[PDB]
Amino acid sequence: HGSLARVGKVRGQTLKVAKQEKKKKRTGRAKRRMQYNRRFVNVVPTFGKKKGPNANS
Amino acid sequence: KEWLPVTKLGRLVKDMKIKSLEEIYLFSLPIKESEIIDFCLGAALKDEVLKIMPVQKQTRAGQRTRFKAFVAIGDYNGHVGLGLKCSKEVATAIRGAIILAKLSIVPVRRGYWGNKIGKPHTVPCKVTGRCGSVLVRLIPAPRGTGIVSAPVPKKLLLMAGIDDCYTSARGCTATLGNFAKATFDAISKTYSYLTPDLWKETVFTKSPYQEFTNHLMKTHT
Amino acid sequence: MQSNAGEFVDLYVPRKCSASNRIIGAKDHASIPMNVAEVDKVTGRFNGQSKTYAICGAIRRMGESDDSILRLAKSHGIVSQNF
Amino acid sequence: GKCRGLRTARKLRSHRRDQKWHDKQYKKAHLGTALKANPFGGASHAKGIVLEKVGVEAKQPNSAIRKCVRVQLIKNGKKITAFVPNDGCLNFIEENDEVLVAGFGRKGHAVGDIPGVRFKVVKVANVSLLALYKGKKERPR
Amino acid sequence: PVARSWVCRKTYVTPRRPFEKSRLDQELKLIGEYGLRNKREVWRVKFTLAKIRKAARELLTLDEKDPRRLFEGNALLRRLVRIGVLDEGKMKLDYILGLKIEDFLERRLQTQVFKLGLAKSIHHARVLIRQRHIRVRKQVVNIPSFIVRLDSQKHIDFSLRSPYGGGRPGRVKRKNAKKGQGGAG
RNA sequence: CUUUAAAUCCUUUAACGAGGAUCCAUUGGAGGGCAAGUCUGGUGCCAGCAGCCGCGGUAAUUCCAGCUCCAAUAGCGUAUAUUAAAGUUGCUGCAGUUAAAAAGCUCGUAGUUGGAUCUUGGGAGCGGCCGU
Numbered sequence: 001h002g003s004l005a006r007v008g009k010v011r012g013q014t015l016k017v018a019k020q021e022k023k024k025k026r027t028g029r030a031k032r033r034m035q036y037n038r039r040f041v042n043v044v045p046t047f048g049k050k051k052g053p054n055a056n057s
Numbered sequence: 058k059e060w061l062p063v064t065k066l067g068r069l070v071k072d073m074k075i076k077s078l079e080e081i082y083l084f085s086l087p088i089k090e091s092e093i094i095d096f097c098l099g100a101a102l103k104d105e106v107l108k109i110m111p112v113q114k115q116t117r118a119g120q121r122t123r124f125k126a127f128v129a130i131g132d133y134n135g136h137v138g139l140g141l142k143c144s145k146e147v148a149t150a151i152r153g154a155i156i157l158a159k160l161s162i163v164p165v166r167r168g169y170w171g172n173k174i175g176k177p178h179t180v181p182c183k184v185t186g187r188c189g190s191v192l193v194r195l196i197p198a199p200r201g202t203g204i205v206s207a208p209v210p211k212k213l214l215l216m217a218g219i220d221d222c223y224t225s226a227r228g229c230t231a232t233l234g235n236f237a238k239a240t241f242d243a244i245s246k247t248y249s250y251l252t253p254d255l256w257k258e259t260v261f262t263k264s265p266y267q268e269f270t271n272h273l274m275k276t277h278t
Numbered sequence: 279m280q281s282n283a284g285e286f287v288d289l290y291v292p293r294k295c296s297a298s299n300r301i302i303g304a305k306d307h308a309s310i311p312m313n314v315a316e317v318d319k320v321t322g323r324f325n326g327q328s329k330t331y332a333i334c335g336a337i338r339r340m341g342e343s344d345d346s347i348l349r350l351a352k353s354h355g356i357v358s359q360n361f
Numbered sequence: 362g363k364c365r366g367l368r369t370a371r372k373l374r375s376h377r378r379d380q381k382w383h384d385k386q387y388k389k390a391h392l393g394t395a396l397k398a399n400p401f402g403g404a405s406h407a408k409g410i411v412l413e414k415v416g417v418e419a420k421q422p423n424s425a426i427r428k429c430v431r432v433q434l435i436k437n438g439k440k441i442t443a444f445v446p447n448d449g450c451l452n453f454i455e456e457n458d459e460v461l462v463a464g465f466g467r468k469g470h471a472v473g474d475i476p477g478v479r480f481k482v483v484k485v486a487n488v489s490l491l492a493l494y495k496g497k498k499e500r501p502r
Numbered sequence: 503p504v505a506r507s508w509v510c511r512k513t514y515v516t517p518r519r520p521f522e523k524s525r526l527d528q529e530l531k532l533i534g535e536y537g538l539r540n541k542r543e544v545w546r547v548k549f550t551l552a553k554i555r556k557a558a559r560e561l562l563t564l565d566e567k568d569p570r571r572l573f574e575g576n577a578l579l580r581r582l583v584r585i586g587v588l589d590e591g592k593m594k595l596d597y598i599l600g601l602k603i604e605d606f607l608e609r610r611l612q613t614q615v616f617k618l619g620l621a622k623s624i625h626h627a628r629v630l631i632r633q634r635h636i637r638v639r640k641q642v643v644n645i646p647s648f649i650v651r652l653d654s655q656k657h658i659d660f661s662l663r664s665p666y667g668g669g670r671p672g673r674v675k676r677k678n679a680k681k682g683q684g685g686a687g
Numbered sequence: 688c689u690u691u692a693a694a695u696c697c698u699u700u701a702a703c704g705a706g707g708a709u710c711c712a713u714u715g716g717a718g719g720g721c722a723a724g725u726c727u728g729g730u731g732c733c734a735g736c737a738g739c740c741g742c743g744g745u746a747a748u749u750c751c752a753g754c755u756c757c758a759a760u761a762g763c764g765u766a767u768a769u770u771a772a773a774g775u776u777g778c779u780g781c782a783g784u785u786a787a788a789a790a791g792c793u794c795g796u797a798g799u800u801g802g803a804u805c806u807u808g809g810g811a812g813c814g815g816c817c818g819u
Contacts, residue, residue: 002426002733004416008449010734010751017728017753024711027760029539033625036534054717054724054756079290082304084311135289163304166288171562172596174282199559200599208522227774248292249303254279259294261311261330362778366799373778381776390768405767423743424732448735448751463766466738473737483766491764518772521722521758540760673704 060092065266068277070096075265082164082248084264094138094159101132104155105212108233109147126150127237130158131216138162139213139241141234165217166247170199179221182250186242189235190228195243198223209233210240217244295334297346308335312347314356329354399469400439406483409434411458414451415442419474427475430454430482432462443480447494450482458486514545515552536607537616537624543647547606554578558598585609586652611638611648611658618658620666630666637661 002009026034062068067090069075078097081088088094094102107127113120124147131137140158144150168181179197186193193210202221204214207230214222230236266273279288293302293311302309311332316325331350333343351357364372381387389395401407409432416426428451432441443462445451454460461484465472469479482490485500492498517525529544538544557578564571575595582588587605588597607613612627615636621627630636631646638648639657650658660667665675 004414004426004428004451006426006733007428007451008734010730011448012734012751013730014751015729019752020754022754023707024709027712029533029537029625029628031760032530032533032539033537036530039530040534052723052756054726056724056726056755083290083293085293085302085304085306085309087305087307161305164289169281172282173280174596175600177281177287199562200596201555201601225774245303245305248290249301249306251294251299251301254288255292255294255301259296259332261293261332264311267313362780364799365778369799370778372799377776377778384776387776401767403768419732422732423737423741425735425743426733427735466766468767473739473741481766516759519721523722526722526758541758542760 062090062092062277064090065273066090067093068273069265069269072272072276074269074272079164080265083262086265088160091156091159094162098132098136098162101134102130102159103133103216104158105129105216106151106154107209107212107237109150110234112143124150125234126154127234128154128158129213129216129237129241130155130162131213132218133216134218136162136164137213137217137241137244139237141238163245164248165219165244166250167217167219168197168252170197170221178219180219180244181247182252184243184246184250186239186244186246188238188242189232191230191232191235191239192227193236193239193243194225194227195240196223196225197221207236209236210243213237213240213244219244293332295337296331296350297333297337297342300334300336302332302334306335308338309333310338310343314351314354329356395469400434400437400441400480401464402436404436406461406463407434407436408459408461409441409443411454411456411460412440413456414454417442417444417475417478420476423474425474427478429475429478430460432460432480434462435459441480442475442478443482444475444478445482446490450490450494453490453493453500454482454485460485513549514542515549516545532603532607535624536604536610536613537628538607539628544603547603550606551601551603554582554598555601558595561595584651584653585649586655606649609649610646611636611643611650612646614650614655614658620658620660635660635664635666 025031060071062071066075066081066086066088070081070090070093075081078088078093081093105128107129108125110125110127111122112125113122123143123145125141125143126147128140128142128151129137130140138158138161140154140156140161142150142153142157144153166181167177167179169177170179178200179202180195182197184195186195195210195214198205198221200221202223204211204219204222204224206214206222206224207226209230210224210226214224224240226236226239228235279286279291281287292304293309294300295302309332311330313328313330316327316329317323318325329351331347333346337343337346348357348361352359352361362373366372396403411430412433413431415429415431417429419425419427427444429442429444430451432443433439434441441462443460444465445454460482462480463483465475465479465481467479471477471479484490485493488498488500493500519525529541532538532544533541557574561571561575561578578598579588579593579595582598582601583590583593585606586609587601608617612631613624615621615627615630616624620636621630628646631643631648634642634644636643637659638650638654640662642661642663661669663669665672671679
């Protein structure tokens with residue numbers, strides 16, 4: 001099934017959610033400072049396995 | 058919690074009468090108690106699970122999946138082990154491969170590239186090791202070179218306390234068991250290489266089974 | 279195994295087979311340091327001092343371990359030169 | 362090597378020279394057959410005119426209909442199935458439109474599902490197919 | 503046939519494995535610790551070291567009392583002593599091999615402005631240099647990468663034409679003074 | 688002002704010139720290889736993704752989107768020639784019982800490679816039997 005008539009079926013019918021208005025992200029060394037301050041100087045060793053940066057359930 | 062030694066050598070180790078595993082490795086004594094290495098190098102021993110590998114045997118009804126765990130162990134100052142344990146669950150495989158690695162730890166002789174000043178930093182001579190097809194060659198390098206290597210032997214050589222080394226693997230290195238064993242066979246053979254440093258004719262010191270032969274008769278059955 | 283200063287730097291000096299002069303690895307579990315008892319030549323009794331011969335696994339499985347100890351004892355004055 | 366003679370330099374060299382034609386990558390790049398046969402004529406890209414839009418059946422296990430385009434080139438006049446890459450981008454292509462076609466990735470070899478399709482579509486009527494897809498540029502009409 | 507140069511080299515090398523966790527770990531440590539802006543900044547200090555190191559190893563293949571090795575050696579050592587990376591006790595060229603990337607970031611003028619206590623943080627220090635506040639012997643250095651020499655270290659201070667030194671008060675203070683006078687009358 | 692043939696750009700410098708400092712950083716990805724979500728909505732072998740293995744058949748960590756995260760960063764993706772990786776052209780340095788591979792066998796001219804053997808013991812000095 002699905003000859004040339006079904007082109008852009010899913011991209012066509014996706015429920016177009018508007019992109020959220022966001023506070024602008026720092027760049028250059030400021031981003032890279034923020035990154036260093038997140039990775040090292042904050043965290044302490046936790047019991048069990050270490051989780052990822054984007055770890056959600 | 059309280060360790061109870063069953064072998065002869067383990068009983069000497071516990072009673073502080075053989076006082077460093079340098080003395081065990083002088084007489085090529087098979088270590089079979091796990092807590093001998095936990096006693097001597099206990100604080101300087103770190104564990105990294107190289108690979109969890111599911112293996113299967115085809116049965117009447119489906120597959121019997123067991124998990125093969127490769128654990129590289131060693132203090133970042135003289136010693137490495139390499140333990141392989143296959144089990145039905147992953148936690149048993151890891152723990153068993155930690156024990157088998159500890160049992161299997163060997164001392165690495167490390168030498169100098171050219172100038173012989175300070176502490177030793179590299180492999181003392183070109184030493185090949187292998188199992189399967191995987192041939193690994195470890196080569197002395199100058200100070201600050203790092204371990205120029207694939208990420209597996211790089212992980213064992215770091216654990217061996219070798220700062221600087223050139224490698225050169227051959228054959229199917231993608232099979233990790235062979236590659237990890239081959240690079241462990243390569244650093245095994247450092248104190249099995251007869252350099253001119255080791256020509257001074259041997260002074261045979263007394264065995265720990267002779268030095269404390271009168272102690273072992275009473276201390277246990 | 280000196281550095282430039284002179285410090286003995288390697289962590290143990292491995293034994294070396296008395297027959298072949300080949301060093302004995304930390305896990306050559308077929309090695310054998312055999313102690314041969316000495317004799318007060320007038321009495322024929324154990325003194326307390328003894329000769330120590332090491333052999334690597336390789337020679338033992340080669341089957342040459344007895345003839346090596348035979349030469350080492352003959353080369354120590356234990357076995358008769360006649361033999 | 363096998364002849365380790367001190368005066369074996371023409372035997373060692375002429376042997377390598379002869380055996381180097383059994384290397385597939387070498388023979389391809391050092392004969393005129395692979396280049397004279399190449400539709401692009403040894404170019405990175407090429408512009409051609411869209412003549413029909415084709416629905417190519419995916420090789421198998423994964424069974425979808427890949428919306429390619431049959432393209433007649435300008436330089437040679439040779440005919441090419443060029444894959445229209447992104448989702449629902451066959452709507453951006455009409456008949457008799459100049460398309461910049463590129464290779465697919467594997468240097469004159471079919472890539473994944475699509476059988477006998479070696480090329481993809483980059484630009485349509487001097488407008489990039491990404492800009493149309495994202496909607497940063499509109500089609501010139 | 504134009505009267506131009508064309509001579510140019512790269513100052514960095516991108517690493518072979520792009521996503522080594524242990525490399526991304528250690529390089530971001532170096533960036534955050536010495537307040538750099540990108541991985542190219544670590545990679546170029548690494549490449550300056552590797553050049554020095556390659557030169558040093560090339561000299562160690564040559565025999566002692568080789569006039570090339572003595573001249574070139576003493577020059578490479580004197581160059582490292584000047585920039586304050588190698589000590590005058592350690593000017594034998596087998597100590598260049600025992601030398602790390604951190605020792606060159608220590609001589610970075612951003613990190614010296616921090617460690618000489620005329621900046622609050624490593625990130626403040628870059629702002630000061632990049633906003634042409636500091637001078638090195640009555641010469642305003644705008645650029646934080648300035649490898650400070652051992653000769654030229656104690657002469658680092660604020661520019662005479664900067665309000666943190668004896669300078670004209672800046673744009674914000676002068677507007678806030680005009681606001682304070684505008685409000686009153 | 689300086690620059691310059693005359694200018695421009697930089698440099699120098701008055702005066703202006705920053706709070707969501709809207710003076711708003713992108714380009715590719717987030718199954719593994721390969722750093723980074725088994726998050727929600729839509730689709731349901733369709734649309735599509737996918738260099739490779741593969742993801743899609745109504746719980747999609749792989750599609751199309753929202754959020755978030757990762758990488759490099761004023762740059763980043765793609766196509767193609769090419770180098771390393773390739774000890775997958777092998778002089779260093781590969782292979783040829785069974786994976787691709789030793790001529791059916793022998794002779795044979797170029798080619799290539801070729802056994803051992805023909806100067807040794809001293810005379811002289813310095814440094815602490817040895818070394819120049």
